[PDB]
Design a protein around this ligand. Structure first.
Ligand SMILES: *C(=O)[C@@H]([C@@H]1N=C(C(=O)O)[C@@H](S[C@@H]2CN[C@H](C(=O)Nc3cccc(C(=O)O)c3)C2)[C@@H]1C)[C@@H](C)O
Length: 267
């Protein structure tokens, strides 16, 4: 260990996901987010060593100037072990900004869990290692506020959460504002798409889209989803009238074509 002198106004710390020792789904990218913008992305990439077992080819792609992602071309093979060494201590990351410390994470890939929300049937079907285990009626985004098609990575889950218009700039007492209690909410996009309990749309679920974009399901089915899906599992939306989820959403990584992802956006 060689010591590096430092200043609190020229240091940046990396933060790695997923957590050390976690079991995650086949869609989980390695994520390294810095608490500062990174001027020299190539220097950050050269300081990060990702190794996998069984070994698979992967590559870095930056979602923005703060966070880089690493993933293979296809979903992970279940049982894969992944080691992440972020060896940024003392590294010159550009513009007088230096890496504050090293971080090391290890994680493993669990079962393959892919839930397909098909707008033609209004059914969300969960497959585990290829086998259907659950079929849930759903109501997705109305035509004016559709659910985007594409591959979504499961993120955080909440027993209870408040959806509040103030966060998008719309006061609660506006014609378009809302303050909504939601149970059993599984996040699948940073943009705000959740699978969640929607008692108010149970008659439409399986029939017609009435949501602002979220995947409405019954209270019991939402609780089931909360219990059985984990960070890194996949939700694929198909056949809606929306476009495609943006690749740099935060959970939209798999919608970027591999040739573009692998080419990267550092150098
Ligand atoms: C489920 O539907 C889920 C929310 N509900 C949302 C909504 O009410 O629109 C969306 S938020 C997401 C952020 N980008 C788009 C969007 O167009 N937001 C928007 C809509 C109207 C006005 C404004 C504005 O002026 O700021 C922004 C959709 C998401 C699916 C939970 C949180 O209800």
């Amino acid at each position: 260990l060689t010591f590096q002198t430092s200043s609190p106004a020229h240091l940046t710390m990396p933060y790695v996901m997923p957590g050390d020792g976690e079991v995650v789904g086949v869609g989980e990218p390695v994520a390294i987010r810095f608490d500062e913008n990174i001027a020299d992305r190539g220097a950050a990439e050269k300081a990060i060593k990702i190794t996998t077992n069984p070994p698979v080819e992967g590559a870095f792609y930056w979602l923005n100037n703060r966070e880089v992602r690493w993933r293979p071309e296809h979903f992970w093979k279940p049982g894969t072990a992944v080691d992440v060494a972020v060896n940024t201590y003392g590294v010159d990351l550009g513009e007088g900004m230096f890496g504050e410390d090293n971080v090391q994470t290890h994680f493993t890939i669990g079962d393959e869990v892919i839930a397909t929300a098909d707008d033609n049937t209004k059914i969300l079907t969960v497959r585990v290692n290829g086998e259907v285990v659950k079929s849930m009626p759903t109501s997705m985004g109305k035509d004016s506020t559709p659910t985007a098609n594409g591959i979504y990575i499961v993120g955080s889950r909440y027993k209870h959460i408040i959806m509040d218009s103030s966060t998008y700039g719309v006061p609660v007492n506006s014609p378009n504002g809302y303050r909504t209690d939601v149970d059993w909410a599984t996040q699948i996009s940073y943009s705000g798409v959740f699978v969640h309990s929607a008692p108010w749309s149970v008659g439409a679920q399986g029939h017609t889209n009435t949501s602002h974009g979220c995947l409405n399901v019954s209270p019991s089915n939402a609780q089931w989803f909360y219990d059985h899906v984990k960070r890194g599992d996949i939700v694929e939306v198909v056949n809606t009238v929306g476009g495609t989820l943006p690749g740099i959403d935060g959970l939209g990584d798999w919608n970027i074509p591999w040739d573009q992802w692998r080419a990267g956006n550092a150098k």
